[PDB]
């Protein structure tokens, strides 16, 4: 029939959108760790109200190369735009050569696409039922897109390669911030895959993932830290699922090795998470608790 | 060539004619042929005008298109030798042969209408 679903962002959730904004229109703080997304229209309306638009353009076309000089905040400082004014033309803020944005809508509101949620649900069904003709049931279970998620629940995070030695990927991401409660609607035409059936399916998938990937990264400080946070057995009982992009490629060992070789094809012939500076806490990206009504 | 004119009775099968040919899909051909017949009536000499010839070209184009749209009509056109006679008429560029063709088409059409569901 019809059911209302709530999503609790256990870890950062990010959805690959395909719009990577570089140093262009990007202002960051090296001493407050906050990055300010800037209203293009309002910013340029100010630029024309000070008749420095030509200056800004001439800066824009040919970057000065010097790393410190490279940057829009530096451009604003060269034009001595007041910190009060520099705040006045800010669209929004979050806490960095490139940035990948989440999707936004015509109202530029961030939402979790129902296609991504449906794909993750089908992934658990395919893994648990060995694709019990899951190509067929795919049509009879319908997922709505998400309602808007206000900015205060958006954050920038560095991609961290959790391993024996925690590495840092060069680029960053916009992703939902912790604990966000997100509701959408689901519709059921195939009652064979009951809600409880799906729930147990998710549980089984996560249990399999636990003994195939999570138990492997033990003897890592940040790795063990996340496992301890909250508790793994209680989380196993909950319908936890990894969402969107940035989740591990995984989401017998020998066949897994061969397949991973194929997929990466050094790659021709590694865990993703995010590590916080604020609390020195790492959460792997993708995990969310999912509940029904 | 009159064997192709009385073959229509030879194509009365079971209970469809020319595999279900109806005059509803052939009315366009009759109108186009009649339009060119009136132009030929206005023409006084035998040697056809080049624009009239191009009209014949467009006619055959319509023939091919109609054959493409509908299968029974395609069978009619092929099994009655429509395209060869059209090309022959184009080759001869004579009015009198054209009138002969129109009469032939008229006989085909009328006989076809005689037998219909």
């Amino acid at each position: 029939k019809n059911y209302e679903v709530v999503i609790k962002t256990l870890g950062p959730i990010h959805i690959g959108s395909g719009q990577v904004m570089k140093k262009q229109d990007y202002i960051y703080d090296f001493y407050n760790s906050k990055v300010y997304m800037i209203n293009g229209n309002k910013l340029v309306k100010f630029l024309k109200r000070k008749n420095l638009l030509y200056t800004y353009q001439n800066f824009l076309r040919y970057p000065p190369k010097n790393p410190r000089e490279n940057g829009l905040k530096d451009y604003l400082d060269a034009q001595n735009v007041k910190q009060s004014e520099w705040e006045a033309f800010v669209s929004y803020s979050e806490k960095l050569n490139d940035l990948h944005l989440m999707v936004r809508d015509g109202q530029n509101k961030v939402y979790l696409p129902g296609s991504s949620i449906k794909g993750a649900i089908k992934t658990t069904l395919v893994s648990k039922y060995n694709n019990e003709k899951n190509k067929d049931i795919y049509s009879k279970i319908k997922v709505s897109d998400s309602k808007p998620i206000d900015e205060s629940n958006l954050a920038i995070y560095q991609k961290i390669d959790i391993n024996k030695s925690e590495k840092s990927m060069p680029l960053y991401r916009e992703c939902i911030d912790v604990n966000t409660e997100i509701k959408f609607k689901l519709t059921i035409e195939d009652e064979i895959y009951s809600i409880n059936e799906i729930e147990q399916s998710i549980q089984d998938f996560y249990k399999n993932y636990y003994d195939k990937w999570l138990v492997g990264f033990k003897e890592t400080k940040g790795g063990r830290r996340f496992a301890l946070e909250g508790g793994i057995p209680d989380v196993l009982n909950q319908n936890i699922l990894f969402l969107g992009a940035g989740t591990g490629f995984v989401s017998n060992r020998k066949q897994a090795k061969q397949d991973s070789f194929e997929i990466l094809t050094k790659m021709k012939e590694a865990l993703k998470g995010t590590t916080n500076q604020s609390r020195h806490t790492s959460y792997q990206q993708g995990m969310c608790k999912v509940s029904f009504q | 060539m009159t064997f192709a004119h009385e073959v229509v009775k030879s194509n009365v099968k079971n209970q469809v004619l020319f595999n279900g040919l109806t005059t509803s899909k052939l009315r366009n051909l009759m109108e186009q042929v009649n339009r060119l017949y009136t132009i030929a009536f206005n023409s006084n000499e035998d040697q056809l005008n080049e624009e009239f010839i191009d009209e014949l070209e467009y006619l055959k184009i319509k023939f091919y298109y109609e054959a493409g749209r509908e299968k029974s009509v395609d069978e009619f056109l092929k099994k009655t030798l429509m395209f060869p006679i059209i090309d022959r008429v184009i080759k001869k560029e004579s009015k009198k042969f054209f009138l002969d063709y129109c009469k032939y088409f008229e006989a085909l059409v009328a006989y076809a209408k005689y037998y219909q569901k």
Binding site: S144, D145, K185 | -
Partner: protein
């Protein structure tokens, strides 16, 4: 004889793609070059869902004879019994306030949504594209109900009201399963236009 007008306005809630014209565009009103909802779509989603909520026998599916309440409510005459459509669903168009708000807030009329394809065992990224109509927009529609019996109006209107709720909960257009098709209705107005009927 009497005719009953229905005036109301749909608000789009999830991204919406009808895409009749199909990089796979959407239908557009050529005098305005603007999205519309081809009321055929309303009719079809309507009748399909209603058949679903009523009896839909497998034999009845095969023979396309629909439930008698459904058939009488929308007119079929495919089983030989003369039946005139008792309700007409027309098209709908953008609202003046909706277009004015879009221009004032510089809101784009269409969104291109990337749909990435990931294959198991290969995970090969081939994006696809699709267009959606801006969510939250509102169209003005009309439903024209015809009276053919002064005693059947109440029953027919009851079915229409329940069906409006079903349409709101379900998805309209294509890709309903992936999150495209959730609309709401607002500002329903009822007013008979021809005849001496009490509404």
């Amino acid at each position: 004889y009497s005719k009953i007008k229905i005036s109301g306005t749909i608000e789009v809630v999830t991204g919406l793609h009808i895409g009749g014209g199909g990089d796979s565009p959407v239908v557009r009103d050529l005098q305005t070059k603007l999205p519309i909802i081809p009321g055929s779509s309303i009719k079809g989603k309507m009748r399909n869902l209603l058949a679903k909520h009523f009896g839909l026998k497998m034999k009845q599916e095969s023979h396309n004879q629909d439930d008698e309440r459904v058939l009488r409510l929308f007119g079929s005459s495919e089983k030989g019994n003369i039946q005139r459509a008792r309700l007409q669903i027309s098209d709908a168009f953008f609202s003046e306030k909706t277009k004015e708000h879009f221009a004032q807030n510089d809101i784009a009329y269409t969104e291109t949504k990337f749909e990435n394809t990931i294959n198991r065992l290969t995970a090969v990224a081939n994006p696809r594209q699709i267009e959606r109509v801006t969510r939250g927009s509102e169209f003005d529609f009309v439903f024209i109900y015809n009276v053919d019996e002064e005693s059947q109006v109440e029953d027919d209107f009851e079915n229409i009201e329940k069906a409006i709720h079903l349409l709101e909960n379900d998805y309209l257009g294509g890709g309903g399963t992936r999150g495209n098709g959730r609309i709401q209705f607002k500002d329903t107005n009822i007013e008979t236009v021809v005849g001496e009927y009490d509404s």
